[PDB]
């Protein structure tokens, strides 16, 4: 009914999208291998009433044209894929990537999902699976029942020590996947990602060689959320939220006044 009503609606919706992003980051403040997200704003199209530079009279053009904006929206939710802090634990099955790389797991549908979460465990058959829904890690790493200690090297080589044999007996190899633009990955929940068209083609390889990170055993990657930054952003986004509500309040009082008078 009023142009300022629609513009302020876009302002209210964008701030709700921003606060929902910050609230998501605060909720996952203890998730392992969680990447924080930030909302990217951009102004919408501008209504072209008077064209800037239009030939208003000869040898003269409109310096500033009458152009009214249509509001703003959150155009994207960018994942900040910066490395998180390392947690030291006594568990031998939780690993971390020191640098670029993703662990690959087998989804129930058959596809390969990429995860930075290193909390792994074993199932009844001894295959190394995630400590969440139990998705097996690609390639399969099976621990023999005679193993007394499990060690994962820098190059991702999984070896065990068997009672009655000097030198470790290799049982598998870990490979991690990197992407040119990890921010284009699709979050499918459960600390998993899927490649998209904007992410690029997956590129496998041994960890440690050719830019890939190193597998650190008995170590976990904390979420990269800074609650100090998250809390301050909520306060700012709340203020901007109330800025647009005053415009809706002002417009509503304007329309009410015209009905009573005119």
């Amino acid at each position: 009914m009023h142009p300022a009503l629609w513009v302020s609606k876009t302002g209210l919706d964008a701030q709700q999208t921003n606060i929902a992003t910050i609230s998501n980051n605060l909720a996952n403040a203890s998730t392992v291998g969680y990447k924080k997200s930030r909302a990217v704003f951009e102004d919408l199209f501008y209504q072209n009433i008077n064209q800037p530079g239009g030939q208003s009279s000869q040898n003269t053009e409109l310096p500033s044209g009458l152009m009214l904006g249509a509001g703003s929206k959150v155009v994207a939710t960018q994942k900040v894929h910066t490395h998180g802090n390392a947690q030291t634990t006594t568990n031998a099955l939780d690993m971390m990537v020191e640098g670029d790389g993703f662990f690959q797991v087998t989804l129930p549908d058959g596809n390969i999902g990429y995860t930075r979460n290193g909390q792994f465990t074993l199932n009844g058959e001894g295959t190394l699976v995630t400590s969440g829904s139990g998705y097996p890690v690609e390639p399969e790493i099976v621990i023999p029942e005679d193993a007394i200690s499990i060690t994962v090297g820098t190059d991702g080589e999984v070896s065990v020590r068997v009672r009655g044999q000097q030198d470790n007996q290799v049982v598998g190899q870990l490979t991690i996947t990197d992407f040119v633009n990890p921010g284009g990955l699709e979050p499918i929940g459960q600390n998993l990602y899927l490649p998209t068209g904007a992410s690029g083609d997956p590129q496998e390889g041994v960890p440690g060689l050719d830019g890939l990170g190193e597998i650190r055993q008995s170590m976990l990657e904390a979420s990269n959320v800074n609650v100090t930054e998250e809390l301050v952003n909520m306060i700012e986004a709340q203020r901007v939220y109330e800025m647009n509500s005053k415009v809706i309040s002002s417009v509503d009082k304007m329309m009410s006044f015209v009905n009573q008078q005119l």
């Binding site: 998501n24 909720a27 996952n28 997200s37 400590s131 929940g189």
Partner: peptide, 18 residues
């Protein structure tokens, strides 16, 4: 493109056996 998360779900309470 704009995908705010659904929150944080409890995955599993482990039973560390060290």
């Amino acid at each position: 493109k704009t995908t705010p998360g659904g929150g944080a779900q409890a995955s599993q309470v482990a039973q560390q056996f060290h």
